[PDB]
Design a binder for this molecule. Structure first.
Ligand SMILES: Cc1cc2nc3c(=O)[nH]c(=O)nc-3n(C[C@H](O)[C@H](O)[C@H](O)COP(=O)(O)OP(=O)(O)OC[C@H]3O[C@@H](n4cnc5c(N)ncnc54)[C@H](O)[C@@H]3O)c2cc1C
Ligand SMILES: Cc1cc2nc3c(=O)[nH]c(=O)nc-3n(C[C@H](O)[C@H](O)[C@H](O)COP(=O)(O)OP(=O)(O)OC[C@H]3O[C@@H](n4cnc5c(N)ncnc54)[C@H](O)[C@@H]3O)c2cc1C
Lengths: 454, 452
């Protein structure tokens, strides 16, 4: 077969790259080893975890509702229709713009031709001028951990759970680990989160991390800091983890969420002259182009920031660079978002970086406890913090935690991206929002900032 | 994949073998290289030629009927009618396969060992299939000599002739076989000066002399020019017409050319040397009375006599032998579908004369037949050879419209044993009237007059 742009993997990066390329008028093909389109964006990652989290939140609201346990399988059963709808929508998207697909593992043979091998023994060959690599990553699996044990799971096999455990252990304080800890705590299981550092999500703001830790501890998430595993043992009834500090923790299950490794082992990277680091990531430039001129890598496969929306935008920019239609833009200022119960999101500098850089900033706070919308939604916990320059009133950082955090942070991001005097805090006083909504926070927050300035 | 019986070829032999094997309760599968089921019987051989012949008969009757006068048509329009029949037949065969839970694999089959095969499709496929019992029904192809340019647009065979787009003014057919005679009759009915070339001095020497003479007379009266005892020397394809130079020194120029001399077995691609099976010069496979090859678990059936019904029966017999219903297909009623048709069963007059059997001949001419007169097909003849003393039937020959359907009553009477196989049955049995089966009765009486 002959094409112009060939995409590996149908994740957000691959889908975005292929759509931008077909928007340019080229002839484009996509290859994905999964039997269905979507990848970890919909099959094992974002969609199943988010459906589980939303079901857990609804269960929690129902239990605490004055108007009125649940098996894990019943809770997870809400995700199959969502994934079916998403895969149908993406299949229709691909069919309408006429992109041919191949459901098989893709391997490299030269600079222009690839081998697609399916489960039947199918062998096909694709040739194109431009290639996009969006193989993503897989859960990092250390050798000394018996993942074949029925009671030991990773970020993928955890969905195979057939019963809600009495206790559980989570290793790694990453985004996935914290999200799963929050979800399981909502389900009503004593989760023992294990962290290699002293503070949860040290890249976040200190206040937000402290509030998240307080809520997790108040919701049975026993958090142990500064820990490194020594030896994991699987039994008939439970799993026992011996830490290097000497503590032995026994649970009825086990989940590993410490890092991810890029999918490059089966790609045959040596056949083209490219090499991947120990993390399985491919070095790319500001154009998302590797050392090979016609080879482009984008999305989570490159490592940072390993965010599905960020991966989609990175693939879109890589396709724009391939077509050179001015649509390229290096995706660097990604607003971080952690989907625990409740949510967390941030955009821009934190208070620690601002303190280090000696920027004369000021803090405006808005607490969700005194909020009409938050109380009406029965969400008492949460806060919103805005860091703004004292003199120029420019917003240098927005951090929110609580109800609808990710949706709230977008307006602060939009105000942030303005240039010069346009990016000012006083906008929140010169613009009328709706009421009662969560956006009203900004208004209050703005005042709580400008009252601190003399 | 694992199965009990694996058949190669979806023609009548393969389909019959698969159906008989699946009737035994085993798990069976079929493989073929054609993108549709049916085999050469439906896609390139029997069915298209029969549709062409029936359409030619219909247009001939329409032209000759005074009622329809108050009109030559292109070859493509005549051939168009076969597509519907082919589609219906392939749909019926696919339904038969699916209702019986038969696995089909559309790719060329190659032998690896005595129990497994590789299936390769157009796109570099590889599929392994292992089964206890195997059936070979690969059929055959038109024989292609090296010294003729089949790639020439004006030179065709028994398969590529359907690719003709325009009806030629003149045409040459080489080989006086059943296929050659049928195509010569069809093209003569279409209104083309056909120059049939025969290697021997008599058309269809395996038939009775009277039947062959009548067929030759009809072909001569239908613009077909028959040349006897000729062998080709060189076929040259010009831009306007094909010129054939024969060994006798003649040169014949026409607007087309058809080759129908011999058939070649489709065994080269099978790779039988990987299992210890050899193919002769014609590509056939030697088998015993049980349709079994040298290998104990390898069986071959179908494409002598290269008859579709005979191939079907041979395939079913091979399947029965595999499942332990076996019957050696040896006596097949020979049928040539020219205009009019020809059929024969049992011994001919020449063989009876050689063996000095005291027989007698009963004739019933179709010219005096009422149903034949209504059919406006008066040319015909029904000859019955019956033993004089014991009144047993030793041979039945017919040459006329609806010959194949007529011959089956004589065949049914033939297969009876002893006194049951008697000509007097045709005297003591009430037939339908007006039918050409009742002609048998007349023939029987025409025999009983000669008795004394
Ligand atoms: C539990 C969980 C929750 C998450 N929640 C979020 C969230 O809320 N927001 C967010 O932004 N991110 C989230 N993520 C991260 C998200 O999974 C990634 O950011 C996203 O997958 C990045 O897009 P991608 O296309 O690079 O990844 P993928 O979608 O994983 O791309 C890899 C695709 O390529 C295929 N592939 C891989 N190797 C080959 C090969 N050799 N041959 C052929 N095909 C191949 C894979 O089968 C897959 O289809 C979450 C992750 C997890 C585990
Ligand atoms: C013009 C014409 C008219 C005819 N008219 C009549 C008639 O009126 N009556 C009659 O009884 N007979 C007639 N025949 C003869 C008839 O074609 C054969 O008798 C019969 O079809 C053979 O049956 P078969 O299944 O054994 O062979 P086929 O029907 O040829 O079956 C072979 C099948 O297997 C496939 N195949 C071949 N090699 C391989 C391979 N290596 N791997 C996989 N698949 C393979 C072929 O493509 C084909 O589909 C006629 C023939 C011709 C050419």
């Amino acid at each position: 077969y002959n094409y112009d742009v060939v995409v590996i993997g149908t994740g957000p990066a691959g889908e975005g790259a292929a759509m931008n390329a077909v928007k340019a008028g080229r002839k484009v093909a996509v290859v994905d080893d999964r039997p269905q389109v979507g990848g970890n964006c919909t099959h094992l990652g974002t969609i199943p975890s988010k459906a589980l989290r939303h079901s857990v939140r609804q269960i929690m609201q129902y239990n605490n509702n004055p108007l009125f346990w649940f098996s894990f399988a019943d809770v997870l059963k809400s995700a199959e229709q969502v994934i079916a709808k998403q895969v149908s929508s993406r299949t229709g998207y691909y069919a309408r713009n006429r992109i041919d697909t191949f459901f098989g593992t893709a391997s490299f043979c030269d600079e222009h031709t690839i081998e697609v091998v399916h489960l039947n023994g199918m062998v096909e060959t694709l040739v194109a001028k431009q290639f996009v690599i969006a193989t993503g990553s897989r859960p990092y699996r250390p050798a000394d951990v018996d993942f074949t044990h029925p009671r030991i799971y990773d970020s993928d096999t955890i969905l195979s759970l057939g019963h809600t455990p009495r206790r559980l252990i989570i290793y790694g304080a990453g985004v996935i680990g914290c999200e799963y800890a929050s979800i399981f705590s909502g389900l009503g299981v004593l989760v023992d989160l294990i962290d290699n550092r002293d503070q949860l999500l040290s890249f976040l703001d200190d206040e937000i991390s402290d509030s998240l830790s307080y809520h997790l501890r108040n919701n049975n998430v026993l958090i142990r800091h500064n820990e490194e595993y020594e030896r994991v043992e699987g039994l008939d009834n439970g799993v026992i983890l011996h830490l290097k500090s000497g503590k032995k923790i026994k649970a009825d299950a086990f989940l590993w969420s410490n890092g991810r490794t890029g999918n490059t082992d089966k790609l045959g990277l040596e056949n083209i002259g490219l090499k991947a680091n120990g993390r399985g990531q491919i070095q790319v430039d500001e154009h998302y182009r590797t050392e090979v001129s016609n080879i482009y890598a984008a999305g989570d496969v490159i490592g940072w920031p390993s965010l599905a929306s960020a991966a989609y935008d990175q693939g879109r920019s890589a396709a724009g660079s391939i077509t050179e239609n001015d649509s390229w833009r290096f995706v660097d200022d990604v607003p971080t978002g952690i989907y625990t119960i409740p949510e967390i999101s941030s955009v821009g500098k934190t208070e620690r970086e601002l303190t280090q850089a000696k920027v004369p900033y000021e803090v405006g706070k808005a607490f969700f406890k005194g909020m009409a919308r938050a109380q009406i939604a029965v969400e008492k916990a949460g806060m919103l913090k805005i860091l703004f320059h004292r003199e120029t009133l420019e917003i240098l950082g927005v951090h929110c935690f609580g109800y609808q955090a990710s949706e709230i942070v977008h307006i602060g991001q939009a105000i942030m991206n303005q240039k010069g005097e346009a990016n000012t805090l006083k906008y929140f006083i010169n613009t009328t929002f709706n009421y009662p909504t969560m956006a009203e926070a900004y208004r209050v927050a703005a005042y709580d900032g400008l009252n601190r300035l003399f």
